[PDB]
Structure formats: structure tokens, C-alpha cells
Amino acid sequence: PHMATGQDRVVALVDMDCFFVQVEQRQNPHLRNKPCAVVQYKSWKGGGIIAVSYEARAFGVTRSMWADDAKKLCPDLLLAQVRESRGKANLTKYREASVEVMEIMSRFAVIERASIDEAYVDLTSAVQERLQKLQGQPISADLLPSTYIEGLPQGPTTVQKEGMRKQGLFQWLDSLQIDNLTSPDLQLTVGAVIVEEMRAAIERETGFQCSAGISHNKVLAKLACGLNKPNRQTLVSHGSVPQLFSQMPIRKIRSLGGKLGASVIEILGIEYMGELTQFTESQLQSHFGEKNGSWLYAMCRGIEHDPVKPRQLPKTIGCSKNFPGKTALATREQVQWWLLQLAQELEERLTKDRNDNDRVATQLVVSIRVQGDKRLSSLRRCCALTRYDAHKMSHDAFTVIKNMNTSGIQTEWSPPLTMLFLCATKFSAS
DNA sequence: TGCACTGT
DNA sequence: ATCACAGTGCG
Ligand SMILES: Nc1ncnc2c1ncn2[C@H]1C[C@H](O)[C@@H](COP(=O)(O)NP(=O)(O)OP(=O)(O)O)O1
Ligand SMILES: [Mg+2]
Ligand SMILES: [Mg+2]
């Protein structure tokens, strides 16, 4: 009677299907419905792949592949390459396309921009509004034309995917308690209806397709989204969690894909998320800390309270470039010119941001990597950002890293710099 | 504050 | 020779 079940919210996670590919496919119809990928640069092995159409994924093409190697799996692979500006890749087209989608989503509910192509949605309020709009009318299956119900169909009493989807949807609806407006299952269902409408508005108004997950928290919504990609949405009810987690690898839950998740596996000697239920909260806290332990004890039961943050804009605006192998920057003149290229794109983006969103960045973060450093960043320094001036930002950034040159020869730079990073942070209203 | 960690 | 980003938590 007093055991909480984590069914107080309706949360959704929307994620664009092969987003960068869709952006290029909208612009160039010749790429539509083909095996294609978006590539970065072209000189080193045809460029690095950062996005792959589902037609190409069937040949085994993946993100991070070199295009020359992808061509070995998919000889007819088509390629759109990222725009290059001031010597570097420039992602403006995709950031702007992202804004298109985010603004549409914001018409239905407050969203948390989680990445360039996905956003969390708190639908608890909209669900209640819709629950009263209908005078206890049953939810027709025609309002959920692309929804999957995780765990269904099941039980006693065809062999195509869409047939299965309908089967599971019918079982779900036929047992829904439509008279109880407080039923969590009914609230998820209404949430799914709204997400159907949200995804329809996105495709109508931008041409982009997406998938979504609907559940009671962000981790389940995220996990649900990926169960039936692309162009489908999945509803993960509280009751579906025991079976879903019983065979769910720990690394699949958000925040457990790295070192922490591996230590959970190595220390506890378990494989699946569900196995965590057999440990006490104090046990999990003793191994992984007070916060992580409490989070794991609740999460393996499908409970999580991370709120959907009202944040439609990114908190930072950054610009970087790697200088691999022999292209490392070994002269103060080289560092001077590239710091200026970055500063110029940053000024461009910062001026636009200030005009569009009534805010100004107040701190400039400068980071570099040094050739041979095992880590991806070696130094991070911040300085005041008093003016949107590329030459000042680039001059200041040089000043804050300058002390890092171990070459008495003023013109030389050692060790060579393999990365430059400028980031505008600490925004204030303007 | 600077970095490790986690993610797209 | 992945690369270009972006958010969170620790001491
Ligand atoms: N490591 C990386 N480097 C550069 N760009 C990247 C990247 N990872 C992602 N992007 C860019 C490229 C992506 O288009 C976009 C969204 O990332 P996802 O949602 O993780 N992958 P997608 O949406 O393409 O396919 P689907 O969602 O259907 O699985 O961010
Ligand atoms: Mg995506
Ligand atoms: Mg995504």
C-alpha cells in the first residue's frame, strides 16, 4: 500500500531516424530510399561515416566506418558529405534542421533537448487534458497506427510484423480500464495517442520520420524508443518491466553503457538488469556509492525520478577540430591560424544565438590535446568572454594555452597539438 | 574550477 | 587518422 511504483508521470523520448541522412535526403531527392550515408571529409579513406540509412545498414554499414570500407560492404552506397567551412566540418544544416523539429515538439508539451536529434517530453499534463476531453470514450486502435505494446501479444490464442503489432495492440486495448482516469496504463495509452499526433505533425511539416518511446520515466522511454526502430513508437508499461529486464543486458540502460555498468557486472556477477532486484539498497550503495546505489535499486524495478528539464536550447556552443598524425600543429603560426578559424565559426554561431534567443555567453573555454596524450583532452582553461569578436576570442585562447609550449624557440610548438576546442558557456539573459 | 564519464 | 560535438557529477 505504501510501496511506490514510479507511475506518476507520462514521459516520451522522440529520436529522429538516421537524422543527418534524412536531412540530406530531403535536400537531394536522388538519395531517397537508397543505401546512403553522411560522411565527414573525403581524403582519409573516403571520409568517416557519421550517419547511415537503414537501407545501407542492411549491408552492415555502421557509424565510424571509413567510406572506402563501407563501399566494400555496399558497392552502391551513396554519400552526402558534411559542409566544410574555414578548413573544418560545419554542422549548421543539422542544427537548423534540429530546431525545426524541436519547435514543433514544443507545441504539444515542454521538451528537454537531449541531443541534436532527440528530446524528452513530459506528457503528464497533456494526458490529463485529453483524458477529460473524451467523455469516457474508449481508445480506438486507429488512433495508435504505429504503436507497439512491449510484451504483447502473449498467452493462448499472424506471421508478419504488422500482424503481430495489431495482435498485441488489441490485447492491450481490450483489457484497458477506461473508466479509471487515474490508471497508469490508460495514461500511457493516451500519451501514445499524443505522440502519434506529434510524430505526424513532425513528418507533415518537415518530411522527417522518427521513433518514440512512451513510459513513466526517461530511462524506460529511451529504452522503449529503440525497441522498434525506425518509424515506430513503443509503449513500455510498468507491468512489462519484469519480463523486459529479465533478459536485458545491463549496458542497454542509459548511464550503464560504460565503466559503471561494467563494474556492476564484474562485482555482482550478473548479466541482466532484472538480476539487480535481488540486492538491497544498502548493498548497491556499498559497491557503487550512495547516489548510484539508490538509483540502481529503483531502476531495476522500473522506477526513476530524473525530471524532464524545461530546456529547448543547448547550454553551450562549441567548436573543435582534430589534427591527427602528421597534421599536428607544430608551429605557433599554425595554432594561431586555426584558433582563428574556430573563433570565426564560433562568432558566427554566437551572434546568431544572441539574436535568436536573447542571451549572451560570458565564458570562453579553451581545450587542447597534445600529441601522445592517451586521453582525448589534455588541458581545459577558461577566460572571460566579453565580446563576440573572433580575433579577441582567438587571441585570448592563445594566451591561455601559450604557457603549454615547451619550445624555447618562440616559433616552434612542442609537443604538437592534435586538437583545438573553443566553447562558449555561462549564458545570461540579454 | 578542471577533469572523468557518458552519450549522440 | 574517428570526428564533432553536448550534459552531468566529483573532489
Ligand atoms: N559519434 C558521432 N559523431 C558525429 N556525429 C554523430 C555521432 N553520433 C551521432 N551523430 C549525429 C549523426 C546522427 O544522424 C545524429 C543522431 O544520432 P543517433 O540518433 O545516435 N543516430 P541516427 O539518428 O543517425 O540513426 P537512428 O537514430 O535511426 O539510430 O547525430
Ligand atoms: Mg537518431
Ligand atoms: Mg538520437
Mutation choice for ligand 1 from A16, A17, A25, CB with most ligand atoms inside 8 A: A16
- A370: β partners: A417
Of the candidates A83, A88, A60, the residue with the CA atom closest to the CA atom of residue A73: A60
Q: Give the residue before each break in chain A, using a C-to-N cut-off of over 2.5 angstroms; say none if it is continuous.
A: 157
Question: A355 and A224, same structural domain?
Answer: no
Query: How are beta strands A78-81 and A36-40 bridged, if at all?
Result: parallel
Q: Which amino acid is at A413?
A: W
Question: A158 and A43, same structural domain?
Answer: no
Is any atom of strand C within 7 angstroms of residue A374's beta carbon?
A: no
C-beta A19 within 6 A of ligand 1: yes
Question: A239 and A354, same structural domain?
Answer: no
Q: Which amino acid is at A358?
A: D
Q: What's the grid cell of residue A89? A: 566540418
CATH number at residue A342: 3.30.1490.100
CA atoms within 13 A on the CB side of A258: 3
By C1' distance from the Cα of A383, the closest nucleotide is: B1
C-beta A120 within 6 A of ligand 1: no
Query: Which DSSP string do the residues of A258-280 spell out, in sequence order?
Result: SHHHHHHHHHHT--BGGGGGGS-
Question: A206 and A94, same structural domain?
Answer: yes
CA of A302 to C1' of B3 (A): 32
Residues A187, A127 contacting (CB under 8 angstroms): yes
Question: A9 and A129, same structural domain?
Answer: yes
Measured in Å, residue A282 CA sits from the centre of ligand 2 at 37
CA pair distance A405, A21, nearest whole angstrom: 41
Ligand 1 closest atom vs CA A54: 28
CATH number at residue A237: 3.30.70.270
Q: DSSP secondary-structure letter at A427? A: E
Question: A366 and A223, same structural domain?
Answer: no
The owner of cell 616559433 is A411
Question: A220 and A102, same structural domain?
Answer: yes
Span between the terminal Cα atoms of chain A, in Å: 50
Question: A294 and A200, same structural domain?
Answer: no
Of the candidates A98, A36, A39, A95, the residue with the CA atom closest to the CA atom of residue A67: A39
CA pair distance A408, A397, nearest whole angstrom: 20
By C1' distance from the Cα of A318, the closest nucleotide is: C5
Question: A358 and A244, same structural domain?
Answer: no
Chain centroid to CA A88:
23
Last residue of a domain, one of A71, A87, A103: A87
C-beta A176 within 6 A of ligand 1: no
- Structural domain including A47 reads 18-87
Strand B neighbours among A 260-319, CB < 7 A: 260-261
Specify the experimental method: X-ray
Say which residues have a Cβ less than 8 Å from residue A3's Cβ, sequence separation at least 6.
none
Q: DSSP secondary-structure letter at A20? A: H
Known binding residue A266? Answer is no
Known binding residue A174? Answer is no
Known binding residue A117? Answer is yes
- A170-174 CB contacts, 8 Å cutoff, 24+ apart: A170/A141, A172/A235, A173/A138, A173/A139, A173/A141
CA pair distance A36, A341, nearest whole angstrom: 30
Indicate the angle between helix axes A184-206 and A92-105, nearest 10 degrees: 130
Question: A244 and A142, same structural domain?
Answer: yes
By C1' distance from the Cα of A257, the closest nucleotide is: B6
Q: DSSP secondary-structure letter at A231? A: S
Is any atom of strand C within 7 angstroms of residue A151's beta carbon?
A: no
Residues A47, A79 contacting (CB under 8 angstroms): yes
Residue A91, classed as helix, strand or coil, is: coil
Of the candidates A179, A78, A176, A85, the residue with the CA atom closest to the CA atom of residue A134: A179
C-beta A95 within 6 A of ligand 1: no
Residue A182, classed as helix, strand or coil, is: coil
Q: What CA–CA distances, in Å, run from A43 to A19, A20, A48, A90? A: 24, 20, 10, 17
Known binding residue A15? Answer is yes
A426 Rama class: left (phi>0) / alpha (psi -120 to 50) / beta: left
CA of A385 to C1' of C7 (A): 21
CA pair distance A258, A425, nearest whole angstrom: 26
Which bases of strand B sit closer than 7 A to a protein CB? 1-8
Residues A412, A330 contacting (CB under 8 angstroms): yes
Residue A57, classed as helix, strand or coil, is: helix
Residue A157, classed as helix, strand or coil, is: coil
CA pair distance A253, A168, nearest whole angstrom: 24
C-beta A51 within 6 A of ligand 1: yes
Residues A214, A224 contacting (CB under 8 angstroms): yes
Resolution, given in Å to one decimal, reads 2.1
CA pair distance A42, A81, nearest whole angstrom: 8
Count CB atoms within 10 A of the CB of residue A174: 9
Query: Which DSSP string do the residues of A294-307 spell out, in sequence order?
Result: HHHHHHTTT-----
Residues A272, A250 contacting (CB under 8 angstroms): yes
The structural domain count of chain A equals 4
Residue nearest to atom 1 of ligand 1 (CA): A50
The owner of cell 510498468 is A238
Q: What's the grid cell of residue A337? A: 591560424
Q: What's the grid cell of residue A392? A: 579577441
Residue A135, classed as helix, strand or coil, is: coil
Is any atom of strand C within 7 angstroms of residue A394's beta carbon?
A: no
